Design a protein that fits this description.
The structure holds four protein chains of four kinds. By secondary structure, chain A is α/β, with parallel strands linked by helices. Chain A has a single domain, classed as P-loop containing nucleotide triphosphate hydrolases (Rossmann fold), CATH 3.40.50.300. Chain A has six helices and six strands; from the N terminus they run H-E-H-E-E-E-H-E-H-H-E-H. Chain A starts with a helix and ends with a helix. Chain B has a single domain, classed as Methylamine Dehydrogenase, Chain H. Helix content of chain B is 5%, strand content 47%. Chain B has two helices and 28 strands. In chain B, the strands form seven sheets. Chain B has a four-stranded antiparallel beta sheet with strand order 1-28-27-26, with no helix packed on it. A four-stranded antiparallel beta sheet of chain B has the order 2-3-4-5, with no helix packed on it. In chain B, strands 6-7-8-9 form a four-stranded antiparallel beta sheet, with no helix packed on it. In chain B, 51% of the residues are buried. By secondary structure, chain C is an all-alpha fold. Chain C contains nine helices and no strands. Chain D is an all-alpha fold. Chain D has one domain. The chains are: A alpha/beta, B mainly beta, C mainly alpha, D mainly alpha. At the B-D interface, helix 1 and strand 17 of B face helix 1 and helix 2 of D. The complex binds ligand J40, cholesterol (10 copies) and palmitic acid (3 copies). It is classed as signaling protein. Keywords: Serotonin, 5-HT1A, GPCR, Complex, G protein, Gi, signaling protein. The assembly is tetrameric. Apo serotonin 1A (5-HT1A) receptor-Gi protein complex.
């Protein structure tokens, strides 16, 4: 009991615990987002337009709210053994390019499969998904120059841009199996910069409000 | 043809199993253990833990970017090193208690120095030569380290120079776990190919390949004798492989477990081994009778790591709940 | 006659004590229930336990014996403690409602400033109000043990303990209902029908939750305060039946065990915590 | 690679099992996890 070194060690442990708790409290007020997509879906351009060799961390500050965006597509490996580490993320931002008919690895089916795997993952039951679509001008030019039956053997319809976009929107939102827990927010990415950040902020706020309501039991 | 010859050689040499020889051996009984101490310092999931050579200081790394070195006697905190990357997958402690390595999703497991004249933790080395997420980097001596990454390669790095001296390749899937033998002359690496390969550090070319699993293998630990090891897989069927015999000896399976394993450890004498499953329970199984000698509870989500001291006094197990339980 | 009432009161007190103790133990013994809302719920459970341990036995003894035989000092202490604890419970309910309002209608504040210190401040404010309206009778101002019937004291207590928090809670919950309905409202035919059905189910769930939360307070507390406000102002008409007076008086005390049942035992996480404890 | 790996000096499986049992029994007296350590000499109490 009457030990000076033991008391000094206890004081050091108390100081370390205080510092750790303070740092945890400081870092707890940060909304985490997980950015996912294909290799060349415009993820880098999207990060650039918001901000203006493995995990890439990006910091955003909009209307007094700190967002930590984690881009993971830099490195390719087995997703089954590190996806679980991203449990609890506020939202998953999935990026898709509309003008993917030209090059065949076909990318549309692969993107659908990836989205289905991510959305139905057992570790993201309560995680919301925000869907971004890129390169509308290229998509419009391609539909003007090429039909839609090439990518969709089992679909026939008009070539109007709005109808095709709505069909793709509905198809993407159709993949999810569970609809009561998670809601998919889909937005069209454009050359503007403020609209994307505003939509991300609105989606995060809606998700937080819905989670709070569910905790209260109203929702 | 050569694989067929190896299969014939291994099947011909097998006439009886370890079960028959262990029939006359009485059971170890019910080994009941209780959590003597509880360490609650982290605020997120802990993914690794390593015991020191003195069985006093152990280092654990969490997902909040913090690794903490605790005094296992008084449950006091002596070092807490903040990290640039919040994602940490593995940690390792030096035999001499001077350097601590921690790595994760980023293609670097940083080595930090504990003993310094100024008395403050500072960055010592940052090895960056891999392209896949680092799985486990282990210390051999004061000047060498091994790294098992997600690129399907095992790299031998020199801390002083910082460049890799030897590279091991041949795995199709990413390697997950790596353990060092007591003599620090050879090790074993496992990957998603449901197989384990022995690698000799001095020369740097493979010796043997062992199969028997159907899913990915997550943990591998040498027997204290150094002539055999145990591997865990997601099929809930841990298997012990002998290097000298080059064939599986016995199977460790039970009908009440359907979930996978996370870590496998041995005892000082090897009579009883420890397995961490996803049922927030630790299983203590007899290494000879192939029976369940003990069940340990007290975890909520999932057991992430477990380790026995070199002296064999106690065993520390850590789960995703952020509580480390010391059974003795 | 006496035996039945005594047994019923004892069973009620035992059930309330068991519920409050179970809530407190579940909150304390587990690390997954350490939240500001859970802290407020635990404070409410502690107040209910205090009511059950200190005030309820005295009231039961007075009711069964039909007279007070513990002295004037003990009667004054009982009255003060009962008033203080009932006010504490009501204001804890109001504080929980206000915290829910802040959480739902302010996401930025929820993310940034949701430290436990806010719960401590709210609890301190509620206890301060309780002491403020409970001390005056001892500081400022034979067999029967009854509260003072002064017009000023009774109006002050009624308006500062029930009516003001009642109106505040009503306004807060109306705003919550408005916000929740706004959020909910905000081959394709099948999808539209499914969405409409889900929205209707969510609206029904919200309506049921609000109705239960409001009723368990109104129908359990309003009659007692109305009686306490009307009786002192009508000295000519004091022929209120004993049975109805007793039932109205004991409804508020019985409310002590419904609050933990509704606020705590209902939400999924807390019952899962119980199941883990078992 | 397989050509060099195949040429190894292999032993009998039963011999390896016997060696493992002998090693396990030799050090069975120094296992705190197996034999409950009394609190007197236990530094974890
Ligand atoms: C108009 C026509 C006529 C119809 C009109 C007249 C009659 C209408 C009556 C309608 C029914 C109303 C009661 C609702 C019952 C009910 O719905 O419960 C169901 C199952 O639960 C149990 O039954 C199990 C509950 C058991 C709780 C434990 C009780 C025993 C503990 C004793 C204490 C001592 C123990 C030691 C479904 O559960 P739930 O929907 O009620 O659950 C919700 C609850 O209602 C919300 O309040 C709550 O919000 P919060 O509390 O404010 O934070 C939500 O989070 C959620 O928990
Ligand atoms: C559960 C523990 C902690 C608290 C006990 C609360 C209740 C059950 C206890 C507290 C005091 C008790 C009362 C004390 C005095 C008498 C007077 C006697 O003539 C009949 C019984 C009666 C009326 C008792 C019945 C039960 C009682 C009301
Ligand atoms: C009569 C007294 C002395 C003994 C019984 C006290 C307690 C256990 C009783 C009194 C009234 C009961 C409640 C009355 C209404 C409901 C609503 C229903 O949907 C779930 C059960 C619930 C919540 C009951 C649970 C048990 C309860 C709280
Ligand atoms: C005599 C009557 C009024 C009953 C009073 C019981 C009160 C004083 C007791 C019952 C259980 C106790 C709590 C049990 C658990 C803990 C958790 C600990 O980390 C801090 C203290 C705290 C929060 C205790 C404080 C006091 C407490 C709330
Ligand atoms: C049975 C348990 C659970 C609760 C205890 C109930 C009874 C016995 C307790 C509660 C509060 C106590 C009183 C508290 C204050 C005083 C004032 C003092 O000047 C004389 C005794 C007196 C009047 C005490 C007598 C016993 C008492 C009435
Ligand atoms: C980690 C920290 C911040 C958690 C905060 C919990 C605090 C707000 C809670 C836990 C239990 C509560 C106490 C429980 C019992 C009593 C006794 C009563 O006569 C006065 C209030 C008092 C003293 C409460 C005040 C607030 C309290 C201390
Ligand atoms: C006469 C004196 C005491 C003033 C009383 C004013 C009360 C009755 C008023 C003030 C605010 C009102 C509420 C404001 C918001 C809504 C939400 C709406 O969707 C249903 C009605 C409801 C719930 C109102 C009901 C009545 C209300 C509670
Ligand atoms: C003193 C105590 C025992 C009285 C408790 C009575 C409670 C249970 C009564 C009072 C008013 C009732 C509510 C009145 C209105 C509705 C709206 C309806 O769409 C669903 C039921 C619901 C939500 C009722 C459920 C039960 C209710 C809350
Ligand atoms: C929810 C609350 C506010 C309802 C209150 C209802 C009260 C005011 C009602 C219910 C029954 C009524 C009593 C019923 C019987 C009589 C007997 C008669 O000879 C004088 C009046 C008297 C004594 C009534 C006075 C008012 C009374 C007590
Ligand atoms: C369990 C709770 C939450 C709801 C139901 C409580 C009811 C059934 C209980 C609680 C206490 C009981 C009262 C206790 C005391 C008396 C006084 C006596 O002279 C007549 C009966 C009367 C008036 C009882 C009638 C029923 C009663 C009012
Ligand atoms: C003094 C202590 C030891 C007594 C402990 C008794 C506890 C375990 C009892 C009392 C009431 C019980 C609960 C009452 C009702 C429900 C709701 C149901 O849908 C799931 C079980 C659950 C949540 C029960 C679980 C166990 C429970 C919490
Ligand atoms: C005679 C009055 C009886 C009152 C009974 C109240 C029971 C309170 C139970 C509190 C349990 C607190 C558990 C603390 C656990 C810990 O040691 O940390
Ligand atoms: C009789 C009622 C006493 C009230 C006791 C309240 C004790 C609060 C404990 C938490 C202390 C944290 C500091 C709170 C500062 C504050 O008052 O706002
Ligand atoms: C003694 C006073 C009796 C009158 C008080 C009755 C209170 C009943 C509670 C009704 C809850 C209404 C819930 C909101 C309904 C709505 O959506 O408008």
């Amino acid at each position: 009991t009457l030990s000076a070194e033991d008391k000094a060690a206890v004081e050091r442990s108390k100081m370390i615990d205080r510092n750790l708790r303070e740092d945890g409290e400081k870092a707890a007020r940060e909304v985490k987002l997980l950015l996912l997509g294909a290799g060349e879906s415009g993820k880098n351009t999207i990060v650039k337009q918001m901000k203006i060799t493995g995990i890439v961390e990006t910091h955003f500050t909009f209307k007094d709210l700190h967002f930590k965006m984690f881009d993971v597509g830099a490195q390719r490996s087995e997703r089954k053994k590190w996806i679980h580490c991203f449990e609890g993320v506020t939202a998953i931002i999935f990026c898709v390019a509309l003008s993917d008919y030209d090059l065949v690895l076909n990318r549309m089916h692969a993107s659908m499969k990836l989205f289905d795997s991510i959305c139905n993952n057992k570790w993201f039951t309560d995680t919301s998904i925000i869907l971004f679509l890129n390169k509308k001008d290229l998509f419009e030019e391609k539909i003007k120059k090429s039909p839609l039956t090439i990518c969709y053997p089992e679909y026939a319809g008009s070539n109007t841009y709005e109808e095709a976009a709505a069909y793709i929107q509905c198809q993407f939102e159709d993949l999810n199996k569970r609809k009561d827990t998670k809601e998919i927010y889909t937005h069209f990415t454009c050359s503007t910069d403020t609209k994307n950040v505003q939509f991300v902020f609105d989606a995060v706020t809606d998700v937080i409000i819905k989670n709070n309501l569910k905790d209260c039991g109203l929702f | 043809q050569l694989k067929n010859q190896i299969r014939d050689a291994r099947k011909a040499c097998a006439d009886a199993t370890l079960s028959q020889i262990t029939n006359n051996i009485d059971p170890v009984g019910r080994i009941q253990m209780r959590t003597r101490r509880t360490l609650r310092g982290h605020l997120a999931k802990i993914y690794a833990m390593h015991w020191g050579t003195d069985s006093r200081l152990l280092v654990s790394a969490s997902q909040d970017g913090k690794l903490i070195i605790w005094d296992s006697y008084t449950t006091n905190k002596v070092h807490a090193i903040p990290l640039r990357s919040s994602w940490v997958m593995t940690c390792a402690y030096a035999p001499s208690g001077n350097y601590v390595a921690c790595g994760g999703l980023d293609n670097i497991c940083s080595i930090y120095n504990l003993k310094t004249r100024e008395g403050n933790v500072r960055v010592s080395r940052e090895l960056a030569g891999h392209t896949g997420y680092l799985s486990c980097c282990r210390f051999l001596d004061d000047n060498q380290i091994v790294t098992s990454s997600g690129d399907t390669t095992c790299a031998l790095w020199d801390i002083e120079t910082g460049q890799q001296t030897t590279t091991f390749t041949g795995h199709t899937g990413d390697v997950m776990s790596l353990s060092l033998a007591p003599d620090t002359r050879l090790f074993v690496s496992g990957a998603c190919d449901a197989s384990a390969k022995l690698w000799d550090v001095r020369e740097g070319m493979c010796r043997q390949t062992f199969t028997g699993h159907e899913s990915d293998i997550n943990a591998i630990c040498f027997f204290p004798n150094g002539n055999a090891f145990a591997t865990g897989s997601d099929d809930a069927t841990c298997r012990l492989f002998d290097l000298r015999a080059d064939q599986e000896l016995m199977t460790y399976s039970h009908d009440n477990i359907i979930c996978g394993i996370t870590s496998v450890s041995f005892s000082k004498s090897g009579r009883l081994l420890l397995a961490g499953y996803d049922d927030f329970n630790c299983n203590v199984w007899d290494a000879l009778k192939a029976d369940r000698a003990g069940v340990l509870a007290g975890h909520d989500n999932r057991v992430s790591c477990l380790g026995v001291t070199d002296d064999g006094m106690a065993v520390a197990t850590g789960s995703w709940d952020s509580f480390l339980k010391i059974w003795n | 006659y006496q035996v039945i009432t005594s047994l019923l009161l004892g069973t009620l007190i035992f059930c309330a004590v068991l519920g409050n103790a179970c809530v407190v133990a579940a909150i304390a013994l587990e690390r997954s229930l350490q939240n500001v809302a859970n802290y407020l719920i635990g404070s409410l459970a502690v107040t209910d336990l205090m009511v059950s341990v200190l005030v309820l036995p005295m009231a039961a003894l007075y009711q069964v014996l039909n007279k007070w035989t513990l002295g004037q000092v003990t009667c004054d202490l009982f009255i003060a403690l009962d008033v203080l604890c009932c006010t504490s419970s009501i204001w804890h309910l109001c504080a929980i409602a206000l915290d829910r309002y802040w959480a739902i209608t302010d996401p930025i504040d929820y993310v940034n400033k949701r430290t436990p210190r806010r719960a401590a401040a709210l609890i301190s404010l509620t206890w301060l109000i309780g002491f403020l309206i409970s001390i005056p009778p001892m500081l400022g101002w034979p067999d029967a043990c009854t509260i003072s019937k002064d017009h000023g004291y009774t109006i002050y207590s009624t308006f500062g303990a029930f009516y003001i928090p009642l109106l505040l809670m009503l306004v807060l919950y109306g705003r919550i209902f408005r916000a929740a309905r706004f959020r909910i409202r905000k081959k394709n035919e099948r999808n539209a029908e499914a969405k409409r059905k889900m929205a209707l189910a969510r609206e029904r769930k919200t309506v049921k939750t609000l109705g239960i939360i409001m009723g368990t307070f109104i129908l359990c507390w309003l009659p007692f305060f109305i009686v306490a406000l009307v009786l002192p102002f009508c000295e000519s008409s004091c022929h209120m039946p004993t049975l109805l007076g007793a039932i109205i008086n004991w409804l508020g005390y019985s409310n002590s065990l419904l609050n933990p049942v509704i606020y705590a035992y209902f939400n999924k996480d807390f019952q899962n915590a119980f199941k883990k404890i078992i | 690679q397989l050509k060099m790996e195949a040429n190894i000096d292999r032993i009998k499986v039963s011999k390896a099992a016997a060696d493992l049992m002998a090693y396990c029994e030799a050090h069975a007296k120094e296992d705190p996890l197996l034999t409950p350590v009394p609190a007197s000499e236990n530094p974890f109490r």
